[PDB]
Design a protein around this ligand. Structure first.
Ligand SMILES: CN(Cc1cnc2nc(N)nc(N)c2n1)c1ccc(C(=O)N[C@@H](CCC(=O)O)C(=O)O)cc1
Ligand SMILES: CN(Cc1cnc2nc(N)nc(N)c2n1)c1ccc(C(=O)N[C@@H](CCC(=O)O)C(=O)O)cc1
Lengths: 328, 328
């Protein structure tokens, strides 16, 4: 069949632009014995792609995951109609030998969008789950500071915190996202772009300090939060989105004297560290909390594979409310 | 009784200079019931004093620990002749009620200098012990990077690593210190002030990266080490000496894409976190290893209390081979 594919025409300089992407059309070969042909239903765009694109050669397909369905099959374990998670990149059709695929939860109901398998009940949600429960290690009652809180990771971090008995403080970059998070049960939410002083806003948000810091942003924002950590405070380093598009050198590191005196623990992680039983268990817990209403979700769905570069750029700028998903 | 005290005349700018200190003489009050008069035998100078001095008021005594002897006693628990660790600051004589004192290990032998209680078999050695064995969590076979490696901390870090079955790489500030660490069993030792490229020297010392980083220095040196940590590498943040005498703005932080991609664990600590049986067992272990030859030591004894500022400045600049101690 035919397929459309987004490739990296030019390595990004600062924020990506439209000319950095090129759409190519091609004819895929026939299926070989044991292979399947997959048709993309929903594709995701995520901040990590900004970092990962730097390792590609120009002309290479953009990396990324998708929900797809088997439309032709020479693999009896993956008959036509099967829905799978696949990571062929930004492409509408692809061929897989079945080994790099992942079926959805067998209990996946029709009452939630399939696209949540790329979001709250997918890798972003699993990232919040392990970053909070394992890396931060919350037990109950802690005060958690989480930035980029309106994204699919931060929004799930705060809600898992709330249903575990923890106070939550969230930072976002738009008053529109401020209201969205209050509805989700966040104790405090503020717009970091507009607050007069971040240090004063954080101190008022919790004069007692912060036990845990789920950090997606990094940079100067993290230095301010670090100064307000309690002793033995834990920092989960999930991302540094504020530096991914940087043209200049990295900002100053956190004041080492504070870090040592407070004896902070700071561990970075990637969701792929957990597999097997641990990963399956977390997925089921996320699905359960979605059905029970403890974890709400919101999506920004963009129609058209042709608009994937636009969805990626809007997502990086925070212009989209909810998980940015492209519908093929 | 009379005493001499070194005070902070002016807050340091960059490295200290002789004019930043002022020696004073005073008359101590009579011993009340339950008190002792302590005569300093050995006083230590250590890098942390540079940071702590910023919090002092001008005129205040410089902080620090000493090995002292009871020369007059109204406390039956501390008779005349008892050797204690005390922290009255840079002073030759002081009065204590006994609650803030620490007796030496009951098994302390007459075959080692008493000044080791301020070094290898004191707080520097305990910092190396807990930092390496618990914060880094060396298990045997790992490769360890330790800077400020010729100090009492770094020298103990490397030798505990050697006796636990690890490969050890050490950076130092002078050619003379390179030879000393070679004799102690360090696998690789180098002078970071004279190498063409820090990145290349570290690569050659361990082409496959570093499992553990015992960090006393921070700054740019640590950014380079972080770029060569293995996946799940662990960093014990003990000090940030490169920033203590800094004059310019703080250096950039570590590249978070490397920290996240490698999933590094980075925890700061201070030796006071461990007390009681844990601290006492560590001290006995250090004493054992010294008596077995598994931990060699070197001291740079400067004679004269009047030379304590010079000892402190030479120690800060890397001029002294071995733990800097002032003999009263
Ligand atoms: C699949 N996955 C794991 C993950 C993490 N880091 C990686 N890093 C690299 N280099 N490569 C990977 N494949 C990779 N994968 C993900 C996917 C999305 C998000 C994430 O943070 N998504 C945004 C999406 C924001 C939005 O769409 O509005 C969020 O904040 O929820 C994190 C981890
Ligand atoms: C007593 N102690 C614990 C410690 C650590 N940080 C502190 N920081 C502050 N502000 N205050 C303290 N009392 C303090 N104490 C110490 C003492 C010395 C060294 C230390 O690093 N000494 C140098 C001495 C170098 C030399 O003499 O050559 C070394 O590397 O061995 C560390 C911890």
């Amino acid at each position: 069949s035919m397929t459309k594919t987004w490739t990296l025409k030019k390595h990004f300089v600062g924020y990506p632009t439209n000319s950095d992407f090129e759409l190519k059309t091609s004819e895929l070969p026939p299926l070989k014995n044991g292979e399947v042909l997959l048709e993309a239903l929903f594709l995701t765009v995520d901040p990590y792609m900004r970092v990962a694109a730097k390792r590609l050669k120009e002309g290479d397909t953009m990396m990324g995951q998708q929900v797809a369905k088997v439309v032709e099959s020479k693999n009896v374990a993956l008959p036509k109609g099967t829905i799978v998670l696949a990571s062929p990149g930004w492409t509408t059709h692809s061929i897989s030998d079945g080994k790099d695929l992942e079926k959805l939860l067998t209990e996946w109901p029709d009452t939630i969008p399939l696209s949540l398998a790329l979001g709250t009940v997918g890798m972003p949600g699993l990232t919040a789950y392990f970053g909070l429960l394992e890396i931060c290690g919350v037990k109950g009652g802690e005060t958690v500071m989480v930035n980029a809180a309106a994204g699919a990771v931060g929004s799930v971090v705060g809600q898992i915190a709330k249903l575990k008995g923890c106070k939550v403080v969230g930072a976002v970059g738009s008053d529109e996202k401020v209201a969205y998070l209050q509805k989700l049960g966040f104790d405090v939410v503020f717009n970091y772009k507009t607050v007069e002083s971040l240090e004063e806003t954080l101190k008022k948000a919790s004069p007692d300090g912060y036990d845990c810091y789920f950090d997606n942003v990094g940079g100067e924002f993290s230095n301010t939060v670090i100064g307000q950590m309690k002793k033995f405070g834990r920092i989960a380093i999930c991302g540094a989105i504020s530096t991914y598009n940087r043209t200049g050198p990295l900002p100053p590191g956190p004041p080492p004297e504070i870090v040592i005196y407070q004896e902070l623990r700071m561990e970075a992680f990637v969701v792929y560290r957990w597999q097997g039983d641990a990963r399956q268990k977390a997925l089921k817990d996320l699905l359960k909390w979605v059905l029970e209403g403890k974890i709400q979700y919101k999506e920004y769905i963009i129609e058209g594979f042709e608009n994937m570069p636009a969805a990626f750029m809007g997502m990086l700028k925070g212009d989209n409310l909810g998980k940015t998903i492209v519908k093929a």
